[PDB]
Write an enzyme that holds these catalytic residues in place. Structure first.
Site, short mmCIF file in Angstrom:
data_model
loop_
_atom_site.label_atom_id
_atom_site.label_comp_id
_atom_site.label_asym_id
_atom_site.label_seq_id
_atom_site.Cartn_x
_atom_site.Cartn_y
_atom_site.Cartn_z
N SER A 99 0.79 -1.24 0.00
CA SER A 99 0.00 0.00 0.00
C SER A 99 0.82 1.29 0.00
O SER A 99 0.23 2.36 -0.15
CB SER A 99 -0.97 0.05 1.19
OG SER A 99 -1.87 -1.04 1.17
N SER B 251 -5.74 3.85 3.86
CA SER B 251 -5.29 2.78 2.98
C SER B 251 -6.49 2.04 2.37
O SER B 251 -6.53 0.82 2.30
CB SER B 251 -4.35 1.81 3.70
OG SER B 251 -3.40 1.32 2.78
N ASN C 180 -8.52 0.26 -0.12
CA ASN C 180 -8.17 -0.42 -1.37
C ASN C 180 -9.17 -0.11 -2.48
O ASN C 180 -8.77 0.07 -3.64
CB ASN C 180 -8.10 -1.94 -1.16
CG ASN C 180 -6.79 -2.39 -0.55
OD1 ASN C 180 -5.74 -1.77 -0.76
ND2 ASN C 180 -6.83 -3.50 0.18
N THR D 22 1.77 3.71 5.39
CA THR D 22 2.09 2.34 5.76
C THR D 22 1.78 1.36 4.63
O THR D 22 1.05 1.66 3.68
CB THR D 22 1.31 1.91 7.01
OG1 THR D 22 -0.10 2.14 6.79
CG2 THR D 22 1.76 2.68 8.23
N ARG E 254 6.01 -5.49 5.89
CA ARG E 254 5.52 -4.36 6.69
C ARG E 254 6.38 -3.15 6.36
O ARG E 254 7.59 -3.19 6.58
CB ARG E 254 5.55 -4.69 8.19
CG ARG E 254 4.80 -3.69 9.05
CD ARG E 254 3.32 -3.73 8.78
NE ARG E 254 2.56 -3.02 9.80
CZ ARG E 254 1.69 -2.04 9.56
NH1 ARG E 254 1.53 -1.55 8.34
NH2 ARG E 254 0.96 -1.56 10.56
C1 Y33 Z 1 -1.57 -2.19 1.93
O1 Y33 Z 1 -0.40 -2.37 2.21
C2 Y33 Z 1 -2.67 -3.14 2.35
C3 Y33 Z 1 -3.42 -3.58 1.08
C4 Y33 Z 1 -2.45 -4.25 0.12
O2 Y33 Z 1 -4.47 -4.51 1.42
C5 Y33 Z 1 -3.54 -2.46 3.41
C6 Y33 Z 1 -4.80 -1.79 2.87
C7 Y33 Z 1 -3.89 -3.44 4.54
C8 Y33 Z 1 -3.24 -2.81 5.75
S1 Y33 Z 1 -3.42 -3.47 7.30
C9 Y33 Z 1 -5.13 -3.94 7.35
C10 Y33 Z 1 -5.98 -2.67 7.26
N1 Y33 Z 1 -6.39 -2.36 8.64
C11 Y33 Z 1 -6.51 -3.66 9.33
C12 Y33 Z 1 -6.13 -3.48 10.77
O3 Y33 Z 1 -5.55 -2.48 11.13
N2 Y33 Z 1 -6.48 -4.48 11.58
C13 Y33 Z 1 -5.51 -5.28 12.30
C14 Y33 Z 1 -7.88 -4.85 11.77
C15 Y33 Z 1 -5.51 -4.60 8.67
C16 Y33 Z 1 -2.55 -1.72 5.36
C17 Y33 Z 1 -1.68 -0.85 6.14
O4 Y33 Z 1 -1.49 0.27 5.68
O5 Y33 Z 1 -1.14 -1.20 7.20
N3 Y33 Z 1 -2.72 -1.46 4.07
#
Ligand code: Y33
Ligand code: Y33
Ligand code: CA
Ligand code: CL
Ligand code: CL
Ligand code: CL
Ligand code: CL
Ligand code: CL
Ligand code: CL
Ligand code: CL
Lengths: 267, 265
Positions: A46, A107, A109, A212, A220
């Site tokens: 992301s 973030s 999608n 992030t 990560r």
């Molecule tokens: C990008 O890196 C990733 C895409 C590829 O799916 C994305 C959108 C997922 C996450 S972490 C995910 C989103 N929020 C959830 C959370 O915090 N929890 C644990 C419920 C998990 C990210 C990110 O930026 O960290 N981007």
């Protein structure tokens, strides 16, 4: 030297967490401050959404896009981690700027894929990287499959030095108008997803903004800028730690932030 | 259908040991349905939506600038101030950044930053009066305005007064066309209401709202919905001291379902 201590402390983290850590820190002109695995390819995941927003702001700057233009969509736009896209679905659209801010700060999608649809897909993202002098970064797929992070797969990758220099070009190198630059800086500071990653390892008086990412197979990442001791920096951090827990990967990136802090305060 | 509405709300009240205040009005403020509609309830964080309207009015009027930088220090961080915390090192939030954080994250520090600028609770009450709301009153800043001491008339509204205020802001011309659209999009994009009213509404309705959670079991949700191509303003205030936090979410969602049955009838 301070750069030797930086290398040694990152290598300690790599050994103890079974991880690989890519870092590049550059000054506003893109000159290298320090780094680690600087030319190693990592999945962007992301983190590319920040350059995507820069791409969109350049189109607004040039008069080929309007920030308030409504981008209509239906349920097939919704993919995993699409919180704002889901909320706006009944209304039928998100504007260009709404989608860009959701992509950067949540973030989202679906909002990312909505913008990719409008700009001409991954090929248009890659074209923008090339235009601003980044010959390395490449977008090949939409979300979420671009984050599959198969080892050795070169699709959807960057290097830490390429992406740090792309961040510096957007924030300090004149890629955007003064107004658009300030706006995207504020979006990075106000990001909602980075509280436990790099900025958790930086001193509280540093001005920090970042984007992030989380990848399959233990990726990560955190890319952005920090202002410390009356000096501006661009930074890209990419990590791979397949056996750590998700919380442990957050702590890993925060620990990289502390190693960066020790370097900068020694420089 | 109005008797079913009353009966089903009183069943929830009885079984959940709760009080449920509801008002639904059309765009002109005419009553569609309600329950305890003139009983006073603590507004808690729901007042942040009228606060944002006041800010938009001042921007509309030229007496405020949306990009004006509001400086602050760590003293302005109070509980539930996530955006204020993120912007602390930078030293400021703009008027519009603060307003959007107040509406969409229920950021308390951002709310107080704006209250600091307009002259405090007295000026927010003055704005209620200006838009024809003689009932709603702000007496304190966050978080003490949400103390919700039983019987306290400070920091209260009624469901009918607040539903009519929502209608006045969104449909009654309180703001310019552009500012009205912006605040409507902010309510649709609110990040805090996924488990309350909109969880109990059909998924094709266009809904935007502002939540609140208070001490002594307060759980509130105010906003608008477009159903079968008709527009409505709604205010829900509930008090359930013996429910868990998740069960209070479920309570407001269940009120959403009772509202849905009335509207579709
Ligand atoms: C990008 O890196 C990733 C895409 C590829 O799916 C994305 C959108 C997922 C996450 S972490 C995910 C989103 N929020 C959830 C959370 O915090 N929890 C644990 C419920 C998990 C990210 C990110 O930026 O960290 N981007
Ligand atoms: C407003 O009603 C209240 C003020 C007075 O504190 C406020 C800001 C608190 C909450 S809920 C609180 C914030 N997010 C937390 C949460 O959801 N979890 C699960 C930790 C609890 C609200 C609200 O709008 O719901 N407003
Ligand atoms: Ca202070
Ligand atoms: Cl809309
Ligand atoms: Cl350029
Ligand atoms: Cl948040
Ligand atoms: Cl009544
Ligand atoms: Cl009555
Ligand atoms: Cl700033
Ligand atoms: Cl969210």
């Amino acid at each position: 030297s301070e750069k030797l201590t930086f290398k040694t402390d990152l290598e300690k983290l790599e050994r103890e967490k079974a991880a690989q850590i890519g870092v590049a820190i550059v000054d506003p002109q893109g000159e290298i401050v320090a780094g680690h695995r600087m030319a190693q390819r990592f999945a962007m995941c992301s983190t590319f959404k920040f350059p995507l927003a820069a791409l969109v702001f350049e189109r607004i700057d040039s008069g080929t896009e309007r920030g308030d233009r409504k981008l209509s969509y239906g349920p097939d736009m919704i993919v995993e981690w699409s919180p704002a896209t889901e909320r706006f679905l009944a209304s039928g659209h998100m504007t260009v700027l709404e989608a860009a801010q959701a992509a950067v700060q949540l973030s989202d999608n679906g909002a990312t894929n909505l913008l990719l649809r409008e700009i001409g897909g991954p090929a248009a993202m890659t074209q923008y990287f090339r235009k601003i002098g980044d010959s390395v970064s490449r977008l090949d797929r939409k979300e979420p499959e671009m984050s599959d992070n198969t080892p050795g797969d070169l699709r959807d990758t960057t290097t830490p030095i390429a992406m740090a220099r792309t961040v510096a070009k957007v924030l300090y190198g004149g890629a955007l108008t003064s107004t658009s630059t300030h706006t995207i800086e504020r979006w990075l500071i106000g990001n909602q997803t980075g509280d436990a990653t790099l900025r958790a390892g930086f001193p509280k008086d540093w001005v920090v903004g970042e984007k992030t990412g989380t990848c399959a197979n233990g990726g990560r990442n955190d890319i952005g800028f920090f202002k410390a001791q009356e000096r501006d920096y661009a930074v890209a951090v990419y990590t791979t730690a397949p056996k750590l827990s998700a919380v442990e990967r957050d702590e890993l990136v925060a620990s990289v932030g502390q190693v960066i802090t020790q370097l900068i305060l020694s420089t």
